[PDB]
Amino acid sequence: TTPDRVHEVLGRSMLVDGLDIVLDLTRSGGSYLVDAITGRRYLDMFTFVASSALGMNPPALVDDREFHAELMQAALNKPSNSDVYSVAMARFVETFARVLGDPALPHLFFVEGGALAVENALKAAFDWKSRHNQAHGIDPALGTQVLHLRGAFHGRSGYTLSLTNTKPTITARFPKFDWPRIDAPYMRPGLDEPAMAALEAEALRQARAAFETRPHDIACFVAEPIQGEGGDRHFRPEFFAAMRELCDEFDALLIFDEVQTGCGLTGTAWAYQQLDVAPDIVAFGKKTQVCGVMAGRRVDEVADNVFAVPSRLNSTWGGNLTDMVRARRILEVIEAEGLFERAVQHGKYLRARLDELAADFPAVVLDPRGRGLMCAFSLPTTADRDELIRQLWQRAVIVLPAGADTVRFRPPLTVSTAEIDAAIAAVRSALPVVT
Amino acid sequence: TTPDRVHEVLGRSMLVDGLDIVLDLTRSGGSYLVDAITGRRYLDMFTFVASSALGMNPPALVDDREFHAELMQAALNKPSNSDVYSVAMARFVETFARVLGDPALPHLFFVEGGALAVENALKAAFDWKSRHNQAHGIDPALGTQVLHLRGAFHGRSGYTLSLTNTKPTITARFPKFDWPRIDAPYMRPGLDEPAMAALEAEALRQARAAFETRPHDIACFVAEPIQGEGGDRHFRPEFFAAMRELCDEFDALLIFDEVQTGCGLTGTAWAYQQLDVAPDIVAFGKKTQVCGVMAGRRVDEVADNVFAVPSRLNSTWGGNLTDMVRARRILEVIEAEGLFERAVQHGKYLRARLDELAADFPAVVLDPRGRGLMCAFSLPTTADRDELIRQLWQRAVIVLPAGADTVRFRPPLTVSTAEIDAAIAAVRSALPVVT
Numbered sequence: 017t018t019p020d021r022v023h024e025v026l027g028r029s030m031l032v033d034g035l036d037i038v039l040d041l042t043r044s045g046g047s048y049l050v051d052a053i054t055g056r057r058y059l060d061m062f063t064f065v066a067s068s069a070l071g072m073n074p075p076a077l078v079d080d081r082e083f084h085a086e087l088m089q090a091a092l093n094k095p096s097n098s099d100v101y102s103v104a105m106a107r108f109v110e111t112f113a114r115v116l117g118d119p120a121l122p123h124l125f126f127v128e129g130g131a132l133a134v135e136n137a138l139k140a141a142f143d144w145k146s147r148h149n150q151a152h153g154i155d156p157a158l159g160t161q162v163l164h165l166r167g168a169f170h171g172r173s174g175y176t177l178s179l180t181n182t183k184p185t186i187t188a189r190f191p192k193f194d195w196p197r198i199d200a201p202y203m204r205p206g207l208d209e210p211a212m213a214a215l216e217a218e219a220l221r222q223a224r225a226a227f228e229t230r231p232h233d234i235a236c237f238v239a240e241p242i243q244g245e246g247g248d249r250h251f252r253p254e255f256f257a258a259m260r261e262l263c264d265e266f267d268a269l270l271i272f273d274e275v276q277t278g279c280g281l282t283g284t285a286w287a288y289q290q291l292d293v294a295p296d297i298v299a300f301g302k303k304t305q306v307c308g309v310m311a312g313r314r315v316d317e318v319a320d321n322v323f324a325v326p327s328r329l330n331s332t333w334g335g336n337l338t339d340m341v342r343a344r345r346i347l348e349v350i351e352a353e354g355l356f357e358r359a360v361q362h363g364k365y366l367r368a369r370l371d372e373l374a375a376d377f378p379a380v381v382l383d384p385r386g387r388g389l390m391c392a393f394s395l396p397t398t399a400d401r402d403e404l405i406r407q408l409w410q411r412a413v414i415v416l417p418a419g420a421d422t423v424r425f426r427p428p429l430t431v432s433t434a435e436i437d438a439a440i441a442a443v444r445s446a447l448p449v450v451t
Numbered sequence: 452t453t454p455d456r457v458h459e460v461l462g463r464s465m466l467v468d469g470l471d472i473v474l475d476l477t478r479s480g481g482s483y484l485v486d487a488i489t490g491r492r493y494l495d496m497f498t499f500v501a502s503s504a505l506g507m508n509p510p511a512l513v514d515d516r517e518f519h520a521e522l523m524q525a526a527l528n529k530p531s532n533s534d535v536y537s538v539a540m541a542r543f544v545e546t547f548a549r550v551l552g553d554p555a556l557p558h559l560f561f562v563e564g565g566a567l568a569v570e571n572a573l574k575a576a577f578d579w580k581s582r583h584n585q586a587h588g589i590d591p592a593l594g595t596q597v598l599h600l601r602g603a604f605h606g607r608s609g610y611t612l613s614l615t616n617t618k619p620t621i622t623a624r625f626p627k628f629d630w631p632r633i634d635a636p637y638m639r640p641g642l643d644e645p646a647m648a649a650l651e652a653e654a655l656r657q658a659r660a661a662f663e664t665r666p667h668d669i670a671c672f673v674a675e676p677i678q679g680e681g682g683d684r685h686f687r688p689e690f691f692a693a694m695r696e697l698c699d700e701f702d703a704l705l706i707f708d709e710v711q712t713g714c715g716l717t718g719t720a721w722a723y724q725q726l727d728v729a730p731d732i733v734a735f736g737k738k739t740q741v742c743g744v745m746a747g748r749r750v751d752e753v754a755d756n757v758f759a760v761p762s763r764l765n766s767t768w769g770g771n772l773t774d775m776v777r778a779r780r781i782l783e784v785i786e787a788e789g790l791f792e793r794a795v796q797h798g799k800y801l802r803a804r805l806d807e808l809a810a811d812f813p814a815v816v817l818d819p820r821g822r823g824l825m826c827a828f829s830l831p832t833t834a835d836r837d838e839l840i841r842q843l844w845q846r847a848v849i850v851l852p853a854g855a856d857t858v859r860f861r862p863p864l865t866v867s868t869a870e871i872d873a874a875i876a877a878v879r880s881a882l883p884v885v886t
């Protein structure tokens with residue numbers, strides 16, 4: 017089976033709705049994808065839905081003969097790391113703790129899949145709330161609901177389908193728990209301090225009302241620090257600092273879903289580090305390759321929590337050993353080359369260019385915004401947005417849509433300023449055509 | 452970090468409750484695990500919780516220089532196969548269809564994780580039932596419940612936690628849907644044809660009552676063809692053939708969870724092929740490395756089902772490309788070496804030895820049973836079971852417990868009769884010590 021026959025072969029068994037290219041695994045590299053059919057190079061601001069930190073075939077991985085051997089050893093088999101430990105696994109865990117760890121959150125748990133990472137964070141919270149309730153003379157049957165935001169995306173699994181609320185296509189006709197959902201008070205253009213404060217106060221009012229009308233039954237509040245799939249919606253730190261206090265007042269855990277924001281994209285290991293709010297639990301995935309949770313803060317107040325008691329959390333493999341070995345090497349590159357700081361600097365550059373676009377096309381390029389390399393802007397209508405994406409595709413630049421009218425940039429941490437310039441030049445070329 | 456320090460390093464971040472050994476990834480091979488600390492060899496009847504078809508480092512994979520290159524190419528990166536297709540992916544899909552495919556079930560969907568495979572089978576059914584209901588003038592809000600068995604294990608995720616019911620530790624304090632659950636009429640020793648028929652009739656009665664008291668609201672019946680984690684409980688084909696008819700009478704899909712039974716263990720590609728019952732959907736995982744669903748039969752009667760409509764099912768990666776490339780090569784070995792048939796023959800051998808043990812130790816070795824290499828026996832009490840497992844561990848044989856009193860054998864498809872003899876010799880040695 018040959019590149020030109022890939023779509024045909026797959027189409028016999030599956031819905032074939034992805035990109036028109038066929039990925040060349042060997043010739044792709046850095047910020048460029050290679051189409052195996054034409055040899056055409058594509059500028060990648062998409063990074064496999066933001067899951068690639070360094071882009072394709074990074075030199076530090078490709079030229080490292082010792083790493084090749086370690087990776088091969090892992091890749092040939094697939095141990096259940098739940099039950100059977102290895103040196104490869106222990107090296108990953110210690111480097112994860114060194115590069116991404118938070119001293120307040122020492123409990124680590126790994127699994128395959130971002131939705132399942134979020135689910136295990138939820139399970140930790142449900143168990144914590146039931147046991148905390150029990151220890152304080154409250155019915156242990158209480159502690160089963162999850163406070164969350166409108167416009168949230170947390171995955172497509174049994175619990176996260178009750179949380180995710182963006183496109184109806186994701187959730188329609190699937191059974192759900194009736195869990196309390198509040199307005200998301202995100203920053204929008206032309207709202208000053210007082211206007212924002214009033215927006216947040218209303219969300220906060222709705223949050224308090226949920227806690228007071230479902231006493232002892234809300235186990236946690238879950239949020240994305242920046243809502244990705246719902247449209248790159250950013251929140252003031254003040255909002256989360258208030259939610260942190262409300263969570264403590266009502267003995268509920270605060271969980272951040274960093275599956276999209278995490279591993280350096282915003283300029284720090286985690287987006288929450290820049291908001292100055294301490295979570296009790298963090299779910300991670302995508303760029304980390306292996307998915308999972310970090311937990312601590314109030315979790316440790318319940319001595320028999322899911323991190324302390326055998327067999328409360330589990331999966332067959334406990335994460336993919338091949339992903340752990342790759343992730344270990346990627347984390348070492350990040351640490352050695354100062355890639356968080358490179359993300360801060362190139363992030364400021366990308367954002368400056370989007371501000372320039374906004375000035376040049378004030379009616380069309382709306383609400384330029386970003387933290388580190390996680391940047392976006394919006395168009396007047398969804399028709400304009402969809403057309404801009406098509407026009408960029410014709411010009412060999414891959415970007416992702418979000419929400420009704422957003423275009424998002426998800427470059428690798430290793431993106432150069434020339435690559436950012438090429439992307440911006442493509443947008444400038446395409447814009448007169450869309451208008 | 453050195454083998455002797457692995458447990459120490461991990462224990463700083465996680466609950467360290469697995470095996471005492473440290474896996475040597477290089478020196479392990481075939482039916483033997485090597486402890487990197489001592490160099491001691493362990494006879495493996497555990498196969499990473501039945502997820503390894505060929506055992507460690509199979510020669511056909513290890514000596515194949517071309518495969519090394521293909522595997523390396525896949526392992527270096529982690530594409531989102533949801534969006535971006537490759538030759539590596541298409542080769543896996545076409546070989547999966549050739550070796551494991553069923554002409555009635557042409558729709559394939561892949562994901563990381565066995566619980567998520569089962570969940571997507573459930574989502575397919577919920578959508579199917581709602582749309583089928585709608586097409587026939589029934590409220591589309593109906594079609595949200597799942598008929599299932601007592602003693603079932605389907606995973607630890609949001610939907611499967613409402614289905615799984617073995618150890619309370621798995622499910623306690625996690626919110627659940629109230630879905631109908633019926634008695635499991637499994638074969639037990641000293642029940643003849645008429646006695647079994649009466650047991651099944653009672654389960655069937657309970658099934659019918661569920662359908663009649665929740666009209667149009669049961670989307671599917673899910674079962675393991677042989678219950679694994681609940682205790683290697685086997686069912687007559689007559690039971691499932693009756694359930695197949697009842698499912699059709701009430702317009703509900705029949706789903707088999709073959710995550711544990713699948714990929715040759717019972718002597719055929721799938722256990723259902725030996726029961727002569729046609730499912731509408733099959734969930735797979737473990738030995739297949741990549742997890743997922745095969746669907747067809749009645750699913751196709753609803754033209755806008757989840758396999759025909761974009762974005763109803765999804766995950767970020769759509770399965771691990773490294774797992775697809777490994778699985779492709781493993782499937783080729785199975786096909787080339789006739790490993791399904793080898794499983795039938797060595798399965799008969801293993802079962803014959805368990806019958807012999809039963810004869811020699813009639814009060815102690817209870818209910819020897821099996822299909823292909825999926826074999827087991829039970830002990831009088833759980834204390835006896837736990838002790839036998841410990842005694843086997845001291846003798847360097849790894850087996851797994853199940854339920855209250857079962858010991859299960861999960862050898863690789865490539866196990867030899869001498870290896871089976873060694874395992875049985877260890878059990879014979881340990882038994883006088885347990886009594």
Ligand SMILES: *Cc1c(COP(=O)(O)O)cnc(C)c1O
Binds near residue numbers: 132171172274301766
């Ligand atoms: C992608 C995503 C998930 C789901 O991850 P998958 O690997 O596709 O299951 C969860 N939360 C957020 C914020 C996401 O970006």
Ligand SMILES: *Cc1c(COP(=O)(O)O)cnc(C)c1O
Binds near residue numbers: 564567604680710737
């Ligand atoms: C293992 C198992 C699952 C769950 O698989 P994971 O990869 O651990 O999520 C589902 N069903 C059955 C029958 C199982 O054996």
Ligand SMILES: O=C(O)CCC(=O)C(=O)O
Binds near residue numbers: 065172244276765767
């Ligand atoms: O739709 C999905 O399942 C993945 C979506 C996602 O993570 C994103 O596009 O930001």
Ligand SMILES: O=C(O)CCC(=O)C(=O)O
Binds near residue numbers: 607679680
């Ligand atoms: O407990 C788990 O999560 C995995 C169990 C399983 O699949 C088994 O032991 O048969």
